[PDB]
Amino acid sequence: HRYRPGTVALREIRRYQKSTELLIRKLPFQRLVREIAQDFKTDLRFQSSAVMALQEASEAYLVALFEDTNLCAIHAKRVTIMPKDIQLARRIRGERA
Amino acid sequence: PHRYRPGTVALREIRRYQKSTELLIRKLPFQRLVREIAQDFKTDLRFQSSAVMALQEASEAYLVALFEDTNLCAIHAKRVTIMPKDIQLARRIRGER
Amino acid sequence: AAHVIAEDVKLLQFHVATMVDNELPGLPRAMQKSGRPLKSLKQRLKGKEG
Amino acid sequence: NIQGITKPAIRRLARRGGVKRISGLIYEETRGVLKVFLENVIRDAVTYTEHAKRKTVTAMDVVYALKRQGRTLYGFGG
Amino acid sequence: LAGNAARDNKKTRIIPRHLQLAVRNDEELNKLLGRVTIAQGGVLPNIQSVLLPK
DNA sequence: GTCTTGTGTTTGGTGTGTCTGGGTGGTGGCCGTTTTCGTTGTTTTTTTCTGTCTCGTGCCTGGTGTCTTGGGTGTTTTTTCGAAGGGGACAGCGCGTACGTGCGTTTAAGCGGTGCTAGAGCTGTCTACGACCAATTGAG
DNA sequence: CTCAATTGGTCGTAGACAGCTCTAGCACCGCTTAAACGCACGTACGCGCTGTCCCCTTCGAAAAAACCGCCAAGGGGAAAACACCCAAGACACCAGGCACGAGACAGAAAAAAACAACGAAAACGGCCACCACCCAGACACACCAAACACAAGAC
Secondary structure, rough: OOOOOOOHHHHHHHHHHHHHOOOOOOOHHHHHHHHHHOOOOOEEEOHHHHHHHHHHHHHHHHHHHHHHHEEEEEHHOOOOOOHHHHHHHHHHOOOOO | OOOOOOHHHHHHHHHHHHHHOOOOOOOHHHHHHHHHHHHOOOOOOOHHHHHHHHHHHHHHHHHHHHHHHHHHHOOOOOOOOOOOHHHHHHHHHHOOO | HHHHHHHHHHHHHHHHHHHHOOOOOOOOOOOOOOOOEEEOHHHHHHHOOO | HHOOOOOHHHHHHHHHOOOOOOOHHHHHHHHHHHHHHHHHHHHHHHHHHOOOOOOEHHHHHHHHHHHHHHHOOOOOOO | OOOHHHHOOOOOOOOOOHHHHHHHHHHHHHHHHOOOOOOOOOOOOOHHHHOOOO
């Protein structure tokens, strides 16, 4: 049969809040990191542990941002989070000016 | 007779107070409140008038910032202004309790 | 007036189509305003007695 | 590179974030915000690395950058 | 920045108004001082366009 | 199908270690010239005041438009769409009573004038204390 | 296995700490009136919704085509109403500027208090010797990093 759209979503939320491993693929993140750092300094090296620490901080930051954004959407009474939600979120956090 | 339409005066007021910088709370009420709260922590504390005024400046600027965030929460579906749900939201986005 | 020109061309489209097919689906059948529907060029040759 | 943060990866994160329904526009927004984030963090980390005269960015450099940013991370030494 | 704000306020003495205006008008000073509260600074004049009459 | 996985291994860059030693900053005394604070004079800000600007509410003159109307000639089988299911985003417009503008009354905030006092902070005396040290031990 | 933890002791001074006052923060009255309250009122924007828009689908709905031959002879009606004026006009609803209510504020005088200038005390800031240990640099290891390659697999 067909699962009514949105019924697997909650299941996935339940899984991914149960799970705790990192959710971005390790090498692609690492390469994005090396790229960004190259812009600041050439011939840089990273400890693997340092890259994993960056990924941890980045993911946990993003998770908290998504949480806040979701709350904004709910305040919009929207199930669907939107860029305007992220903007409002960060704005209230005072990240973006 | 004469009557400004709704919010005409309110806008004029906002313009006014954003032009000015005085304390918006009446001082002596605030001072009494501070004394009351402190009494809950410790009896027989003397407050430098300057220390009071400092607490007042902080409280006012903090609440004004909070109102700013709250009014930013108004934004969706061209909804207008602020309700306690908005306050609660903004505070939680800040991570305040 | 770009407003009205749209309606003018819509009505021209109605007349020209009804010249060659009176029996459009949904569109009002062109008529001699006293009742009788207009025999379009399709109808001149459409079926039996074409 | 940036698109290496795949749509499924961002979905997975937002699901961990409890997001039920996602506008596709969220993916590029997430990439932009994550880029800004990394930018700041890495800039601080390299600035420690530069001060240490190192070429290797260490885990401690990242920790100290996050400690500055108000993002204190436990797991790699304090 | 604060002296320029004072000048355009047509005042010779920089007062906390002007310090706050300067600090918030420059985005970079605002980032350096984003958590700071300035006594008697008030706010930048800013009304959300939603609020303005059409 | 994809080119990430992450194990497996390669090899050498560079990080960190240890060793040397003299450049450096700290310590100390000493001088001195700078800084702070107290007093006096003034110029800029603020207050009360006049007044005129100005923009809002909406009054007012009367204009741009309109729509009434006297007179009327003529204005059963086959295809394929494109529905519906399954769900949100949003939202136009209705409803309605919340809270804005007002006003009249009541309050007590503010001024400020005056009294009091206690403990903030200063200064002076003593030594409990933490730093340094040599000699000692075993916990990580 | 070893050097960071440990001890008894001295030093000398941090700060206990006790006194001392007089700062300024406590109460207090009391008159003024800005602001608070409260009430009326209403209109606008917080509530509501189902209109509908989006992804994917089939599939059943409208569409639309077809449905003796031909042949005879009635007896209707073809509106013409009323569209759409033409046209002339008085009629709104529309300008828009009148006009000044009420506020804002601009310009002025005046008061005053902020703050500029002058003089005084003193401790901080600088000069010098001199100290030594810190940190630079050198020389070295080695390991952890990049890198290559493959597996299986996340997309």
